[PDB]
Amino acid sequence: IRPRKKGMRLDRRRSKKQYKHGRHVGGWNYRWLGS
Amino acid sequence: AISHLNPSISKGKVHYRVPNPYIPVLLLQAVPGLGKRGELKQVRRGTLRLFLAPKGLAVVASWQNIDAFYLAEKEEEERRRRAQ
């Protein structure tokens, strides 16, 4: 990705999409620590 | 208010018709060609918005304004009688 597009894109962790999937080593239905 | 029936769609925009461009108003001062004080006149919304309300010659005919005018007139009459 080149500078002009980088200057307008946002980082992955600026949203909540990271916490809306259950992907993990054991599969796709991660049970978080502490349930 | 606008009506949402048969709007005009052009240029990607939507324009809504205004079947009733009139609103009732209470006259707070003598307006030459419109009426005397204390009258309820149907005027055009633009006329109310840009001339009457800005110049303080009339106000929308809400129950609050109507009742306030009525009570103020009654108080003024009582004040006249008290002065007499």
Binding site: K16, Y19, W32, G34, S35 | -
Partner: protein
């Protein structure tokens, strides 16, 4: 497509919204990774003023102040906030009750909430040191504000004051009259004497004189009024030449148009200063009387405008009442030499007294003493409740008076004691007030000034002539003591 219902048709934008957690659906019995429970949060300061933590919240809540990081402008603002009757209610609350806070009220209180003023001494010392540090980087106006704010808040550290004096003396020639007025404000009575370095005061007065001499055109009427007030009181000046120049610029400087629009309180203070320094004005009606009339007329005009018009308005009403009281007191001393219903002096005095009568509560103790003095000098009375209702409050506020106020009050009481026609409440109130005022005057004699001593001697002589049947011995003692004290001070 699901057709809406009574409870569901209204919706908010996914990102621009008013947060309402009470109605937003939530499942508290589940783990929510989005909130990052593992991650610790930072406890921010709960109250901020001018972008920094509020010092008025530190005694109760603690926390760092970051005073060393403050620049000159923020420091001057903070000094003003601490000096001008600070209230802990100005601090911000956290998740407050829905009902309005006491900060809305403009009325002062007789008790200090949430801590004593002295609970900020360490922060005051830190602020003084930071002011001494930042004095070198401030512009002229900000430097003058820093100086005045330190003087008013009570920074006393002598090295700090020496540094401030050095910087101010360095940058004095580059300052205009408004900054000179700001600096003079730091020399008001009651402020620390460390700031009253005689050489610095002389330099400030000389610079103000040069500013008047070469820039009289640019001077505003309110600025001239403040300058006269400060010269007579703040700087304790005998500069008859400078005071006369100020008076001429006020009257004959094509300033009549500006005299109407200037605030009445400034005119009242100016005429008070001129009444104090009459002898200078009446030097190579009297000219002082003409000056008093010229300054009085706009005050009467403002009073008339207010009466014809009859939270925001309360401040201007209080200011107008204070202006009326001060103007009446100033006019009384000149009227002492006139003794007549002068075409305008007596009438403006009566109008000011009427304003006082309708706004007795707003009076400060100094205002009460001034108005009593004015009424007794005029031998008039705005109403029949005036004297009793003012004497009651004078007795209730006796402790906050100064020697000048006490001299005025004693003069008024001596004058009133000789009046045969009095109300029963006035008769009951008089003797206790007379005794307490005499005790206070005797206690505060060594701190009285020459004008106060002269007024006290005049009151004693008047009582001996006319009030020889009430505390006669104490009045002879007061007369002799005042004579000796005046002799000593004249020799000084």
């Amino acid at each position: 497509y699901t057709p809406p219902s009574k409870r569901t048709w209204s919706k908010q934008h996914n990102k621009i919204f008013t947060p309402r957690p009470l109605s937003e659906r939530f499942s508290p019995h589940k783990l929510h990774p989005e909130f990052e429970w593992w991650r610790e949060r930072t406890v921010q300061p709960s109250a901020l003023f001018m972008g920094f933590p509020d010092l008025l919240a530190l005694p109760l809540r603690g926390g760092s102040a970051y005073i060393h990081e403050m620049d000159a402008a923020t420091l001057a603002v903070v000094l003003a906030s601490l000096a001008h009757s600070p209230s802990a209610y100005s601090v911000s609350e956290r998740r407050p009750p829905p009902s309005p806070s006491p900060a809305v009220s403009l009325s002062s209180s007789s008790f200090s909430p949430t801590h004593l003023p002295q609970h900020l001494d360490s922060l005051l010392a830190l602020l003084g040191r930071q002011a001494a540090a930042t004095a070198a980087h401030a512009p002229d106006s900000t430097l003058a504000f820093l100086f005045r704010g330190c003087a008013e808040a009570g920074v006393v550290e002598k090295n700090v004051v020496c540094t401030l004096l050095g910087r101010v003396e360095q940058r004095l020639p580059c300052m205009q009259l408004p900054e000179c007025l700001v600096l003079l404000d730091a020399l008001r009575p009651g402020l620390p004497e460390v700031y009253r370095h005689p050489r610095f005061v002389a330099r400030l007065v000389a610079h103000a004189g040069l500013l008047l001499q070469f820039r009289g055109a640019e001077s505003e009427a309110e600025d001239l009024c403040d300058l006269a007030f400060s010269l007579v009181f703040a700087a304790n000046c005998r500069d008859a030449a400078l005071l006369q120049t100020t008076a001429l610029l006020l009257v004959h400087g094509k300033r009549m148009q500006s005299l109407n629009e200037t605030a009445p309180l400034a005119l009242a203070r100016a005429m008070e200063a001129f009444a104090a320094c009459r002898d200078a004005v009446n030097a190579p009606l009297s000219p002082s009387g003409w000056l008093l009339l010229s300054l009085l007329s706009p005050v009467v005009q403002a009073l008339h405008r207010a009466e014809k018009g009859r939270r925001g308005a309360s401040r201007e009403s209080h200011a107008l009442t204070e202006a009326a009281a001060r103007a009446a007191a100033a006019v009384a001393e000149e009227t002492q030499t006139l003794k007549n219903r002068e075409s305008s002096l007596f009438r403006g005095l009566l109008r000011c007294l009427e304003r006082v009568d309708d706004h007795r509560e707003s009076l400060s103790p100094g205002s009460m003493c001034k108005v009593l003095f004015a009424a007794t000098v005029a031998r008039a009375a705005p109403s029949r409740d005036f004297f009793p209702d003012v004497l009651k409050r004078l007795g209730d506020q006796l402790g906050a008076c100064t020697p000048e106020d006490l001299s005025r009050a004693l003069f008024a009481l001596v004058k009133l004691s000789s009046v045969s026609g009095l109300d029963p409440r006035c008769q009951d109130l008089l003797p206790p007030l007379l005794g307490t005022v005499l005790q206070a005057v005797e206690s505060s004699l060594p701190v009285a000034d020459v004008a106060s001593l002269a007024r006290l001697h005049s009151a004693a002589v008047s009582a001996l002539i006319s009030s020889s049947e009430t505390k006669k011995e104490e009045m002879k003692q007061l007369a002799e003591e005042t004579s000796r004290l005046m002799h000593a001070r004249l020799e000084e």
